[PDB]
């Protein structure tokens, strides 16, 4: 499965990242870039593209417009800021239907980190409390925690 | 309606590198036509990021540097800096021969916005203990400083402070060799420093001060002391190299009935002792002018 | 550099591989390179010929010829050494002498023009060692099992969370005069 971490990379959405891999932190220049672990699960081995959603990477993505198979939204819980703006993106995923091949997880994560919104509250700011042709359980992290992830992921690619 | 570039994939698949290998060198013939169409860039681009296979990735990227790269998908095929932080990384390696070989690489690379922190990443480089590696930024500065010079533009001192830090020859010599070409002022203090030292080194650094010297006096003149200091100590000369070098040498700077003797000397010994012929043909050719 | 280009040749009229330091023009310098060869003018014997103050440099060795070409002076035997060195190095890089092998091992061989002579610089001895560098490391590996073992612990751990959750001097005063 193709699994996408997107969000600009380099806030420690990328530290999120560096936590589940190695355990460590950011250790890299904030990272537009992919990156790529195989995380073996049901042994699917799920490769995240950890790719900031500055600018270019954003942009352009096309190869990788193919069809999904996971979704971590990774959050700063502190950003409160670019998800409405993200809202207005983020239909022209729904607009894809490649994108539609995914039962999924938004986290959270960034709690510590200032702070976060209702679990609700969030969830019709992006316009996630809208779907359903793809299940939608919703699962906080922080970025300095995070638990009962995996319930969220066990009921998703036993999808 | 389909094609052999699927027949390919498969292959790949199904040997993994090995079959790749295969493809490596079909794709080489194909590339070496000029050929192809593209497709694979996919591919390749997905299988990459997440791949080690070392030797695959240096023909890969061997392959990326004599072909195009301002492809007409820009410039860059436009991944050209995302894929490259995992190099970057690569290049950060700790992992020495493995930043080494691929500084060998950057010797020959020379793609830009993923230079620009990479400078930052090939300063750290420079300080590992391996000389290999050390040497292999000479050459990419170098490579810099036509491409772009200034993308660097504190370097010709830095580096001549950094000679100072420096003792291996072989490095020495590179340095020598890079830094003249970016100013002889440096070197030429230093070369104040080395007069007695020189006597006791290795040649090869020796011999890349002499065609500098050459060139400036044609300009303009009124140095010689210093170097004649030194220049005697030359008239040892030993090498065969040397001495070939230093008879030539001299007669570039001299042509004095005494100095007319002294390189006659050198080329007429030489040329006893010699035993290649077409060396020997060539000297004449000199003589021949003189 | 020392040498924009070292091609080993066979006798065909064609130089058996290349490698172009500096790419700019097109292979008609080298393409025009390789007709010249592969034509020998026709030339009786003769291991050098420079002509037009361009060095052509070979040593036939066999039906095959290693070839390095340069332009300005150089000091001979060092460059001797090198075709001859040349001529040592092949059995073991590419195996033996017969293109294919070659063919096979092509990436090999121009890592070895690379490796063994930066730019006109005659780098090492040691062929097996000269292996060594690259592809053939040692680092890496230190690195790799401690490390991947740490992440791997990291990971292992993760999959239970996972899972639940005075002579000078006569010349100068001469001179001087």
């Given at each position: 499965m193709r699994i996408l971490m997107v969000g600009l990379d380099g806030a420690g959405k990328t530290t999120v990242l560096y936590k589940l891999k190695l355990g460590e932190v950011i250790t890299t220049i904030p990272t537009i870039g992919f990156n790529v672990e195989t995380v073996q699960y049901k042994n699917?081995?799920?490769?995240?593209?950890?790719?900031?959603?500055?600018?270019?990477?954003?942009?352009?993505?096309?190869?990788?417009?193919r069809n999904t198979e996971g979704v971590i939204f990774v959050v700063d819980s502190n950003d409160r800021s670019r998800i409405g703006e993200a809202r207005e993106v983020m239909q022209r995923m729904l607009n894809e239907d490649e994108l539609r091949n995914a039962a999924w997880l938004v986290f959270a994560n960034k709690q510590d980190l200032p702070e976060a919104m209702s679990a609700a509250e969030i969830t019709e700011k992006l316009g996630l409390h809208s779907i359903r042709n793809r299940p939608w359980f919703i699962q906080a992290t922080c970025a300095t925690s995070g638990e009962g992830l995996y319930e969220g992921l066990e009921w998703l690619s036993n999808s | 309606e389909p094609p052999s570039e699927i027949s390919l994939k498969n292959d790949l698949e199904k040997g993994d590198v090995k079959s790749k290998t295969e493809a490596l060198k079909?794709?080489?013939?194909?590339?070496?036509?000029?050929?192809?169409?593209?497709?694979?860039?996919?591919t390749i681009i997905r299988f990459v990021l997440?791949?080690?296979?070392?030797?695959?990735?240096?023909?890969?990227?061997?392959?990326?540097?004599?072909?195009?790269?301002?492809?007409?998908?820009?410039?860059?095929?436009?991944?050209?800096?995302?894929?490259?932080?995992?190099?970057?990384?690569?290049?950060?390696?700790?992992?020495?021969?493995?930043?080494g070989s691929t500084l060998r690489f950057l010797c020959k690379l020379k793609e830009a916005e993923l230079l620009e922190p990479l400078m930052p990443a090939i300063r750290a480089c420079l300080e590992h203990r391996h000389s290999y590696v050390r040497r292999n930024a000479v050459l990419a500065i170098y490579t810099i400083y036509r491409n772009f010079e200034h993308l660097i533009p504190d370097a010709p001192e830095l580096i001549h402070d950094f000679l100072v830090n420096e003792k291996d020859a072989s490095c020495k010599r590179n340095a020598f060799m890079m830094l003249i070409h970016a100013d002889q002022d440096r070197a030429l203090?230093?070369?104040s420093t080395c007069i007695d030292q020189v006597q006791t080194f290795g040649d090869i650094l020796q011999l890349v001060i002499v065609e500098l010297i050459y060139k400036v006096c044609h300009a303009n003149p009124s140095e010689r002391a210093r170097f004649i200091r030194c220049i005697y100590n030359l008239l040892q000369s030993s090498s065969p190299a040397v001495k070939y070098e230093a008879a030539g040498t001299l007669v570039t700077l001299s042509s004095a009935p005494t100095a007319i003797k002294a390189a006659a000397?050198?080329?007429?010994?030489?040329?006893?002792?010699?035993?290649?012929?077409?060396?020997?043909?060539?000297?004449?050719?000199?003589?021949?002018?003189? | 550099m020392v040498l924009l280009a070292a091609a080993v040749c066979t006798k065909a009229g064609k130089?058996?591989?290349?490698?172009?330091?500096?790419?700019?023009?097109?292979?008609?310098?080298?393409?025009?390179?390789?007709?010249?060869?592969?034509?020998?003018?026709?030339?009786?014997?003769?291991?050098?010929?420079?002509?037009?103050?361009?060095?052509?440099?070979?040593?036939?060795?066999e039906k095959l010829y290693m070839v390095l070409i340069t332009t300005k002076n150089s000091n001979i035997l060092e460059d001797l050494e090198t075709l001859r060195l040349f001529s040592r190095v092949i059995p073991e890089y590419c195996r033996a002498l017969e293109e294919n092998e070659i063919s096979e091992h092509c990436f090999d061989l121009?890592?070895?023009?690379?490796?063994?002579?930066?730019?006109?610089?005659?780098?090492?001895?040691?062929?097996?060692?000269?292996?060594?560098?690259?592809?053939?490391?040692?680092?890496?590996?230190?690195?790799?099992?401690?490390?991947?073992?740490?992440?791997?612990?990291?990971?292992?751990?993760?999959?239970?969370?996972?899972?639940?959750?005075?002579?000078?001097?006569?010349?100068?005063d001469k001179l001087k005069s």
């Open positions: 699917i081995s799920f490769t995240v593209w950890d790719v900031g959603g500055q600018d270019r990477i954003r942009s352009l993505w096309r190869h990788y417009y | 079909k794709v080489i013939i194909m590339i070496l036509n000029g050929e192809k169409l593209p497709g694979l860039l996919m997440p791949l080690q296979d070392h030797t695959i990735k240096k023909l890969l990227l061997v392959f990326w540097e004599i072909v195009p790269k301002t492809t007409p998908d820009g410039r860059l095929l436009h991944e050209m800096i995302l894929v490259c932080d995992a190099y970057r990384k690569d290049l950060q390696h700790p992992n020495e021969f493995i930043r203090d230093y070369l000397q050198c080329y007429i010994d030489l040329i006893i002792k010699e035993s290649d012929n077409n060396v020997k043909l060539i000297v004449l050719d000199r003589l021949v002018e003189l | 130089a058996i591989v290349s490698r172009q330091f500096v790419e700019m023009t097109r292979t008609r310098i080298e393409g025009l390179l390789a007709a010249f060869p592969k034509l020998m003018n026709t030339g009786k014997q003769h291991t050098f010929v420079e002509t037009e103050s361009v060095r052509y440099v070979y040593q036939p060795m121009i890592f070895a023009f690379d490796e063994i002579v930066a730019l006109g610089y005659r780098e090492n001895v040691n062929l097996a060692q000269i292996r060594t560098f690259t592809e053939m490391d040692s680092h890496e590996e230190k690195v790799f099992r401690a490390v991947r073992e740490t992440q791997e612990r990291e990971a292992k751990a993760e999959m239970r969370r996972k899972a639940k959750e005075k002579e000078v001097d006569n010349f100068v």
